[PDB]
Amino acid sequence: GGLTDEAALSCCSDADPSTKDFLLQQTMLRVKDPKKSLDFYTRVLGMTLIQKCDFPIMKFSLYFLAYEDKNDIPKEKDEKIAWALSRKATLELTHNWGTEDDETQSYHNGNSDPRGFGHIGIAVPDVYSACKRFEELGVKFVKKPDDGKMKGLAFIQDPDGYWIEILNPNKMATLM
Amino acid sequence: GGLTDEAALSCCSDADPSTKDFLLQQTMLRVKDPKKSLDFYTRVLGMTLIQKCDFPIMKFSLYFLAYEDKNDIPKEKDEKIAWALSRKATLELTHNWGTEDDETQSYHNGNSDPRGFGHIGIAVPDVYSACKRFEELGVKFVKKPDDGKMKGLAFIQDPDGYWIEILNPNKMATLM
Numbered sequence: 001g002g003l004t005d006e007a008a009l010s011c012c013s014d015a016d017p018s019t020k021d022f023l024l025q026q027t028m029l030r031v032k033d034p035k036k037s038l039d040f041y042t043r044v045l046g047m048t049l050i051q052k053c054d055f056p057i058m059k060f061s062l063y064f065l066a067y068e069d070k071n072d073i074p075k076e077k078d079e080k081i082a083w084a085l086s087r088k089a090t091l092e093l094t095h096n097w098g099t100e101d102d103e104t105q106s107y108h109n110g111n112s113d114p115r116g117f118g119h120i121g122i123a124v125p126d127v128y129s130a131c132k133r134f135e136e137l138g139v140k141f142v143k144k145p146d147d148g149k150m151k152g153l154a155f156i157q158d159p160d161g162y163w164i165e166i167l168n169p170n171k172m173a174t175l176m
Numbered sequence: 177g178g179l180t181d182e183a184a185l186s187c188c189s190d191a192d193p194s195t196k197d198f199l200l201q202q203t204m205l206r207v208k209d210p211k212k213s214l215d216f217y218t219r220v221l222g223m224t225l226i227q228k229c230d231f232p233i234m235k236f237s238l239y240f241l242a243y244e245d246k247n248d249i250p251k252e253k254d255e256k257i258a259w260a261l262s263r264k265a266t267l268e269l270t271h272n273w274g275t276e277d278d279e280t281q282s283y284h285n286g287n288s289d290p291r292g293f294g295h296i297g298i299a300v301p302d303v304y305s306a307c308k309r310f311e312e313l314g315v316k317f318v319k320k321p322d323d324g325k326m327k328g329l330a331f332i333q334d335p336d337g338y339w340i341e342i343l344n345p346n347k348m349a350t351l352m
């Protein structure tokens with residue numbers, strides 16, 4: 001089963017000039033508790049909160065995290081919004097007010113029926129050292145680096161249970 | 177409800193030096209039919225298929241799409257893998273062999289119970305012109321630019337039903 005390389009390529013088209021400056025800006029994930037999520041993404045993963053937006057009428061907040069230098073964040077409101085929303089590879093955490101209190105509430109990580117979304121993935125210089133630190137910090141693992149067939153690739157979970165793949169681009173070909 | 181800016185910031189920690197070179201590399205989505213998905217992401221959205229991997233024993237293929245110049249793709253196998261997996265903001269489409277044939281099968285987009293993942297988002301220079309073209313191409317819309325309270329922001333669906341937010345960073349502050 002599955003397509004051949006030629007079959008896959010025949011389904012691909014060259015980029016229309018009108019799509020020249022498009023960029024993959026964000027991946028939105030709903031989070032039960034923004035306090036737990038902000039701590040995990042900044043302290044554990046090293047991301048930076050680059051923008052926060054609240055919509056009181058709709059009762060939700062958006063938290064934008066990205067691997068950006070805190071010093072690059074514009075000081076001016078409107079200028080910070082356009083900068084934050086033009087960064088690529090950001091995480092848009094959606095907090096629906098009140099979920100933190102609802103003990104029965106939780107979001108679906110997409111890895112059990114019904115499936116869809118799978119995970120976000122972070123490229124790191126060293127999977128082993130990165131995971132050693134994650135263990136020290138008490139991070140939950142779905143797959144430790146040397147568990148299973150694929151060694152040197154890990155999967156951790158965020159506070160909501162979303163999977164995060166930990167990989168080293170420079171050692172992927174070695175397993176594949 | 178919701179955190180205050182100060183409350184949010186107090187939950188954030190500075191990036192540990194060990195996370196210095198981490199980068200948000202991918203968002204994985206499962207696709208029923210890679211032929212429909214590859215056409216949509218390349219022809220409609222302008223992305224480039226930068227890497228394809230097949231795992232016959234496990235019966236699945238991975239398709240990596242990113243807004244990269246086709247000419248930057250390394251020619252050498254192992255060199256292309258490390259380059260593709262070190263690009264940030266890529267989409268990792270997972271094709272489980274056989275889903276295209278199963279008429280009853282479909283993936284969950286996360287926007288109906290049980291919710292979790294919400295959408296990926298593309299920053300474009302002009303939401304209106306981008307959407308005019310999408311309409312011509314017969315793309316399904318969840319929200320046209322001027323529908324609803326938030327004007328100038330759109331949501332389209334991919335072949336699997338995943339939502340894709342279309343936004344112009346330079347006009348977001350105007351609505352917010």
Ligand SMILES: N[C@@H](CCC(=O)N[C@@H](CSCc1ccccc1)C(=O)NCC(=O)O)C(=O)O
Pocket residue numbers: 030053060094096294318319324326329331343348352
């Ligand atoms: N309850 C919502 C909260 C988030 C939400 O509603 N987001 C808006 C968009 S948030 C607007 C926005 C986007 C980028 C930057 C600033 C503001 C949305 O997805 N609307 C879908 C629709 O209109 O059908 C949820 O859980 O998804």
Ligand SMILES: N[C@@H](CCC(=O)N[C@@H](CSCc1ccccc1)C(=O)NCC(=O)O)C(=O)O
Pocket residue numbers: 118142143148150153155167172176206229236238270272
């Ligand atoms: N049937 C799977 C197919 C995809 C899959 O199994 N992917 C592997 C990883 S694919 C390995 C890989 C990653 C990056 C680059 C090349 C290969 C995975 O997520 N494993 C989870 C676990 O071990 O518990 C699905 O639908 O999720």
Ligand SMILES: [Zn+2]
Pocket residue numbers: 026028092295296297341
């Ligand atoms: Zn969004």
Ligand SMILES: [Zn+2]
Pocket residue numbers: 119120121165202204268
């Ligand atoms: Zn992955």
